From a paper:
In this work, we identify the dominant fatty acyl-CoA dehydrogenases (designated FadE1 and FadE2, respectively) required for growth of P. aeruginosa on long- and medium-chain fatty acids. The resulting acyl-CoA enters the β-oxidation cycle, being initially converted to enoyl-CoA by an FAD-dependent fatty acyl-CoA dehydrogenase (FadE), followed by sequential hydration, oxidation, and thiolytic cleavage reactions. The FadE1 enzyme has a broad substrate specificity, being able to use both long- and medium-chain acyl-CoA substrates, whereas FadE2 exclusively uses medium-chain fatty acyl-CoAs. FadE1 (601 residues) and FadE2 (592 residues) had the same overall fold (with the backbone RMSD of 1.001 Å) as other acyl-CoA dehydrogenase (ACAD) superfamily members.
The structure of FadE1 and FadE2 were solved to a resolution of 2.08 Å and 1.94 Å, respectively. However, efforts to solve the FadE2 structure with a bound fatty acyl-CoA ligand failed. However, the substrate cavity of FadE2 was blocked in the middle, allowing FadE2 to only accommodate substrates with a maximum of 8-10 carbon atoms in the acyl chain. The blockage in the FadE2 substrate-binding cavity was due to the side chains of three amino acids; Met130, Glu296, and Gln303. In the crystal structure of FadE2, the side chains of Met130 and Glu296 protrude directly into the substrate channel, creating a physical block. Similarly, and although it is conserved between FadE2 and FadE1, the glutamine residue (Gln303) in FadE2 is oriented towards the substrate channel, whereas in the C16-CoA-bound FadE1E441A structure, the corresponding residue (Gln302) points away from the substrate-binding site. However, by comparing the substrate-bound FadE1E441A structure with that of apo-FadE2 (with no substrate bound) the analogous residues (Tyr440 and Tyr441, respectively) adopt an exclusively “open” configuration. Moreover, unlike the situation in FadE5Ms, where the loop containing Lys338 forms intimate contacts with the pantothenate moiety of the substrate, in both FadE1E441A and FadE2, this loop points away from the substrate. As previously noted, wild-type FadE2 was completely inactive against C16-CoA. One FAD molecule was bound in each protomer of FadE1 and FadE2.
Author numbering:
A (entry chain A): -1 to 592
B (entry chain B): 3 to 592
Amino acid sequence: GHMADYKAPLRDMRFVLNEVFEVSRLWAQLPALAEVVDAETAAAILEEAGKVTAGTIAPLNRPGDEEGCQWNAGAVSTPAGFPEAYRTYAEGGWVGVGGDPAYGGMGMPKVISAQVEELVNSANLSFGLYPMLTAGACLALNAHASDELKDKYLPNMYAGIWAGSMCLTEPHAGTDLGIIRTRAEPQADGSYKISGTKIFITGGEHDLTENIIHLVLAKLPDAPAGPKGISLFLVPKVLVNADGSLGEKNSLGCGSIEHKMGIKASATCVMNFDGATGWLVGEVNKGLAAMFTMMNYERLGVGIQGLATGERSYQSAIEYARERIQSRAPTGPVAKDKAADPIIVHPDVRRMLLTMKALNEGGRAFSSYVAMQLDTAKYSEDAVTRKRAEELVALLTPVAKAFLTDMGLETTIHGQQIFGGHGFIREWGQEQLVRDCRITQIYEGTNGIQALDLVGRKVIGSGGAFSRHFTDEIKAFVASADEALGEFSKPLAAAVENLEELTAWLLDRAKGNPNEIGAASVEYLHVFGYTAYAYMWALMARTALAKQGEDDFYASKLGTARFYFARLLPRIHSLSASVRAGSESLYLLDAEQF
Amino acid sequence: DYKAPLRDMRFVLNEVFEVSRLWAQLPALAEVVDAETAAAILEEAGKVTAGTIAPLNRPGDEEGCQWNAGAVSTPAGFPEAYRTYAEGGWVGVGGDPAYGGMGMPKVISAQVEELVNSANLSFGLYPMLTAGACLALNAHASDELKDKYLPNMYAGIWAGSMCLTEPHAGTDLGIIRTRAEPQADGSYKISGTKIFITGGEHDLTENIIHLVLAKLPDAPAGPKGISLFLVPKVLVNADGSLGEKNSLGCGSIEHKMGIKASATCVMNFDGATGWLVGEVNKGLAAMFTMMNYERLGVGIQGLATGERSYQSAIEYARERIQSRAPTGPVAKDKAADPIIVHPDVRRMLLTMKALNEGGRAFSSYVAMQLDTAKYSEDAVTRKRAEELVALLTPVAKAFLTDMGLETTIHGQQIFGGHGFIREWGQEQLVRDCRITQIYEGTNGIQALDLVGRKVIGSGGAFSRHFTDEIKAFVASADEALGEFSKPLAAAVENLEELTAWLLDRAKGNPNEIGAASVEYLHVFGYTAYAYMWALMARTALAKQGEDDFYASKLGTARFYFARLLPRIHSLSASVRAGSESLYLLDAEQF
Ligand SMILES: Cc1cc2nc3c(=O)[nH]c(=O)nc-3n(C[C@H](O)[C@H](O)[C@H](O)COP(=O)(O)OP(=O)(O)OC[C@H]3O[C@@H](n4cnc5c(N)ncnc54)[C@H](O)[C@@H]3O)c2cc1C
Ligand SMILES: Cc1cc2nc3c(=O)[nH]c(=O)nc-3n(C[C@H](O)[C@H](O)[C@H](O)COP(=O)(O)OP(=O)(O)OC[C@H]3O[C@@H](n4cnc5c(N)ncnc54)[C@H](O)[C@@H]3O)c2cc1C
């Protein structure tokens, strides 16, 4: 089956970064980046990422799903060719592309590392997860670990010689980390002995790397109840001798791997810690704070994973829709040389194709806009600019997490539906992308919890002020619009006004009743998402209108823009009516009446 | 953990639709079914689906089918469970008593179909194909073929298949290439490959009776040259016993996302003996009544996966403790509150609940229309029911399966990370549900049929038959029902206005039909569900106090009206944008 191989969308990625956001203008100013990345460097990095992802990584995706991982007396093996692909990936510098050059990382800004993330996850989501975990663990160690821990573990982790894991989830504890049971017993020598059971640990055990550095959430015996008793620990699979060589295997193991709907090449481990030796990261009781930066970057990364599956689905769907012939166009036969017309002639096929296209390109734009905010928070020399950026990271990362993953699933489902019956057959690859995409809505925080964060902490919690940072920039953009941009800036203004009135309705309603927050959450986040994508599409329309006639690319972009505004943006109205119904109808029945 | 929703089924048929008062003026049914007969059959369907079918769903998925030198084997326990199912009369629950079928009307066979499909969709498909094939033969085959094949097929001893699809011919059956050579003995020799054939080969039965679309050497080109043939796996002697293996077999089976215990075969006919069903060149029409009953059938498959997911999700949401209710800890004795306390978990549960109970009611309503069309003594009542069946079966197929998928996704989401683990059963229900939106006509083709044939083709008369019944219902409503009837009237108004817009916009502009199709069918669906919910609300309002079941119904109705019905506004606005934005790019610009 399949037919369609992965090709990196480098043309669209150049349009978003270089033409829309003009990131290289910003690099010139910020002297932390000025001597790390320019247009030339960035282009060569993406050119190389496209080659390794399409050439080595993508051809492993299907066979990885069909084989899955194997557990053999506590050792986990990845599908054939995974250890070899990983070695190539790590030696190329790809594990630490966004890593700190102070410990041998490449130091690329998030707008570049995010585009690399998208390429690897589109080619093979299971594969992409492995280095994503290592990069995530480096952020937490860099931000909060002691100089001794950082000097001992970070260099091998940015080089991808040593892998990372995040050991948070327990049988009774995923969302509610405050009730974890894993214990850390302080030792006289300054270390801790970690005892407990962790579940659903991605890459908790595998055969890609000689060591895995686990970040383990635990409580000291004397810790407070709840999340304010949580501490974070660095726990190596293999303890490291004084000379930096591998020494004694730590008192921890993988008990089993899970049987899953998807990302079957991603080893998902029950990890048992039996007084495993570990070192505090950050401060006692401040384990959640130790992961604050990690989670901001991981929220965007998981959003990118959802987008990535949508993009892969679309490359297969447009190739299939031009090749597969069935029936005739309703205006009459289009392929008069053939027995039937390519299925792209049919209105409903174009509706599904254009929904995928508008969501993938809008999602790609929004992922870069949020990467730009992470880069401003980190690199801006101005305190007011960094603070505005940080507040925009707090507001938008939940939206990037929940919205890109929800739209990704919708996209992968459209991509499968375009194949008809063939779409249900595994050799065509479309059914795997639905199963792969589905995890991105559940882990690194369920989408329901992402939306409770948004409405609870970022909206109610800031009096609306964090939203208004975003919606004030969109109206400033609207006030700037020429006549031609008016086609997009006018419906955008109306969407922004809808969102502002819904925000005000919610701030009023949440005063009486705390149930109002959770009731509105997921649908409010969607209203916010379609509004944000209207902003991304308006921005992309401005550039394409200016460059119209210079290249066919700009015509395609404007057509996709016009689809988004005509057919997808009106989704805000029903979502706003549903939110405005309130929580009353959610609480008419007691638990027994369900 | 699967329990048949027999109380809800009793409510829909006996309390809302008052199905026994309809059976009173259906003479051909008073001899065959009444309320007690119905209840007792459902109680038996409940036991066999829960006891012997449900336990095989997970291991069936995990094992799937195997191909060994042309022989296809189903998973461990499938043959034994099929034999028990067949011996119980369940394959022929809806079939003609003239050949040993039980003769139960569609309202009752539809509820049996719900139980088997929610227990094990893979399992449910097998008997569904046989019953489908029985409808075609009964309607169109000669007395010789009916007398020879139907009795064993209704008893479940012989299975059926539909051998339609070819590599280049799926949605477009008109471009079929399988040949039928006429023989002097009055039989045909069939040659060609069929693909994606559910139960083309398996180990459940001694014989399989294939209904194969093929063309005679002198057939006219296109769909007007297509004939239907009965092609048995094993030829049958005079004494009715098994003769020689017929000249056909299975080349391979498909590797699928879901329904993995359902054998999907590449069938090779190499001069296989067959017999004409109905008339030469009328092969497609020989399946009109079959495809009407199977469209509702695939609708019910989607609904059934949604109902199984909800039974798991509601048990999990009461048992799993995580965090504390926004208004304060309730489980004072525990480390955390049951996740049913959280607004978002209640939203996902009530969405599943409202779609499942809404789909059950609409399904029963369409089944009631198939029964009225078939058994009504007066021509005008039969004629209107036939028109509502033609209008409503694509809505039942596409809307119950689309709502089914959404329902199974909510049910997985409620389990959190556990929802992605196969042992918990939620993720299988999403993969199994997905097929129902694709086969028996893609939902896109179901939408095209609705707007293209049933609306444009009738000048909106068919939909005015439906909407007239709804407005009569509204006009009759006392003030208590007004809570539901008022927003139902506004939804009916919205649909009519959208219909008028669509009839006008389609004139001279064929692209407008396809462009509006899927989103219009959803507007229709939510309007239809609003009608079903107002009907169930009137009966629950009248019976309030008599039992907690009615308080639960009214509460579910309130959620549907407050949070789901408003979905019509955005869908209406997308439809009204027209086909223009669909046709801005040429194919190369994608
Ligand atoms: C698991 C499985 C079981 C099956 N069982 C059987 C069986 O037992 N017997 C059997 O005969 N068949 C069977 N089929 C085949 C099936 O019923 C259909 O042929 C198939 O679902 C659709 O055909 P396709 O995959 O060739 O899609 P295509 O017809 O190629 O369609 C591809 C896409 O184009 C769209 N499209 C096509 N034509 C039009 C049009 N005119 N207007 C608008 N959109 C259009 C479709 O909606 C779809 O989105 C089965 C299929 C599967 C996957
Ligand atoms: C394939 C896979 C990979 C994973 N990888 C990792 C990993 O590497 N490391 C790791 O530590 N974890 C990992 N996880 C765990 C994952 O993050 C959790 O499963 C997820 O956060 C949900 O937690 P849970 O399964 O315990 O569900 P629960 O927290 O029990 O949630 C159940 C349901 O209740 C809802 N709910 C819970 N609390 C609230 C609340 N306060 N308000 C509203 N709704 C609420 C949830 O949204 C959900 O719908 C992985 C999971 C899987 C399946």
